[PDB]
Design a protein around this ligand. Structure first.
Ligand SMILES: C[C@@H](O)[C@H](NC(=O)c1ccc(C#CC#Cc2ccccc2)cc1)C(=O)NO
Ligand SMILES: [Zn+2]
Ligand SMILES: [Zn+2]
Length: 297
């Protein structure tokens, strides 16, 4: 059978929050079967735990925030993307502050942490959520969709008209049958437009941002000295973001996500909309890994 997976060892890193600019200690730890991912604010007294599930998402302002009462864990999407991409079912994530460190702006640093810790197979069947019927949500011209698919695929289109984006692909459809999350998605950095970043900074936000952890573009140019890591890094980051949000479903997906100018708010609306309709999905396991349309080997 395809087994659940956790970390083999505890592993740590430090960084600063993008929004807050606050130095933060991050710890990833093994967890038992059927735990899922649970975040812990270890700086608080008492310590507050928040399961990484769609129902615990509060704010979605250019990022995904988990909330429990007045306690928040901000910017979970890049770390969760790495967890999803490497097939980690169960883990504890400890934080000394209310925001996951931004690191280099991508999921790469979290992939490094996970691969360094090692992967541990557990004695329980891994559960998958299979999309049975297409589900969609919209806001204005933005759209997010789950489509049945015998495998796992994430498609995304952005539609910027600014000169800097002219001629760029602005679209990708990634079938993970033949695409490596690690090599081809995980290192795509977050990006921001100068006018937007300036607006945030003018309010004392985005304090952790720098050219060292984000792609900065103006109307006409990519400002970063060494350009892009992937030819289509922008849309690849949107895909990375979607995969991170997808993981709030609590299980790996058998299906396709399609995003059209979508963001974290719409992604999360899609999750809650799917979850609510039991006719649109089912949970499956594979006692014989060879019959599975996906592979985590
Ligand atoms: C992509 C979107 O969904 C989103 N990213 C952001 O909203 C975002 C916000 C701020 C910055 C920034 C910055 C900066 C800076 C800087 C540079 C030089 C000197 C001082 C500051 C980058 C991305 C995101 O990726 N969510 O997952
Ligand atoms: Zn423009
Ligand atoms: Zn992002």
């Amino acid at each position: 059978m395809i087994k659940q997976r956790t970390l083999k060892n505890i592993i740590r890193a430090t960084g600063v929050g993008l929004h807050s600019g606050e130095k933060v200690y991050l710890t990833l730890k093994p967890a038992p079967v059927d735990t899922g991912i649970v975040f812990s604010r270890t700086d608080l007294d008492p310590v507050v735990e928040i399961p990484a599930r769609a129902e615990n998402v509060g704010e979605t302002t250019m990022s995904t925030t988990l909330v429990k009462g007045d306690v928040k864990v901000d910017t979970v999407e890049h770390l969760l993307s790495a967890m999803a991409g490497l097939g980690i079912d169960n883990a504890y994530v400890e934080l000394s502050a209310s925001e996951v460190p931004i690191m280099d702006g991508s999921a790469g640093p979290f992939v490094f942490l996970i691969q360094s810790a090692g992967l541990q197979e557990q004695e329980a069947a891994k559960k998958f959520i299979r999309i049975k019927r297409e589900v969609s949500v919209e806001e204005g011209d933005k759209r997010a969709v789950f489509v049945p698919f015998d495998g796992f695929k994430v498609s995304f289109e952005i539609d910027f008209d600014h000169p800097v984006f002219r001629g760029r692909t602005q679209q990708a459809s990634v079938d993970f049958s033949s695409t490596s999350f690690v090599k081809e998605v995980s290192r795509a950095r977050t990006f921001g437009f100068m006018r937007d970043i300036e607006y945030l900074r003018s309010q004392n936000l985005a304090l952790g941002g720098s050219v060292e952890n984000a792609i900065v573009v103006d109307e006409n140019r990519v400002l970063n000295e060494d350009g892009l890591r992937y030819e289509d890094e922008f849309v690849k980051h949107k895909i990375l973001d979607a995969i991170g949000d997808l993981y709030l479903l609590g299980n790996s997906l058998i299906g396709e996500f399609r995003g059209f100018k979508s963001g974290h708010a719409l992604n999360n609306q899609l999750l809650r909309t799917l979850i609510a309709d039991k006719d649109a999905w089912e949970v499956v396991t594979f006692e014989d890994a060879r019959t599975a349309p996906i592979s985590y080997m």
